[PDB]
Amino acid sequence: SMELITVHIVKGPMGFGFTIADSPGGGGQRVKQIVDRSRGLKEGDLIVEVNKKNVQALTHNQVVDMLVESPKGSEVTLLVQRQTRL
Ligand SMILES: [Zn+2]
Ligand SMILES: [Zn+2]
Numbered sequence: 440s441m442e443l444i445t446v447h448i449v450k451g452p453m454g455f456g457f458t459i460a461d462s463p464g465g466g467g468q469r470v471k472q473i474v475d476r477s478r479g480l481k482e483g484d485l486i487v488e489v490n491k492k493n494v495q496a497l498t499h500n501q502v503v504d505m506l507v508e509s510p511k512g513s514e515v516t517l518l519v520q521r522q523t524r525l
Contacts, residue, residue: 440522440523440524441520441521441522441523442520442521442523443487443518443519443520443521444479444484444518444519444521445516445517445518446477446479446480446484446516446517446519447479447514447515447516448476448477448479448480448514448515448516448517449476449512449513449514450509450510450511450512450513450514450515451475451476452511454506455475455476455477455506455515456473456474456475456476456477457470457471457472457473457474457475457477457480458470458471458472458474459471459486459499459502459503460499461499462485466485466487466495466520467485467486467487467494467495467497467502468485468486468494468497468499468502469482469483469484469485469486470482470483470484470486470519480517480519481521483521483522484517484519484520484521485519485520485521486502486517486518486519487518487519487520488516488517488518489502489505489506489515489516489517490515490516491516491518
């Protein structure tokens with residue numbers, strides 16, 4: 440089933456440890472790859488919010504720049520939609 444999950448990720452010296460790309464259904468960005476830190480995130484997670492604010496209407500470049508600009512050593516929260524069917 441589709442669940443909403445809050446995940447906390449501390450930005451490390453090498454970044455947050457994941458990559459994103461556009462959702463085929465147009466509801467935002469999905470987690471493309473977990474390059475790592477991002478322990479509660481999963482590939483395919485739809486990013487619905489960053490720091491409790493909705494980001495579904497933002498483009499790929501906008502979400503990326505939001506993460507890039509987030510300060511060194513600070514945490515970001517993400518609300519994600521995840522298919523939890525095993
Ligand atoms: Zn936290
Ligand atoms: Zn990109």
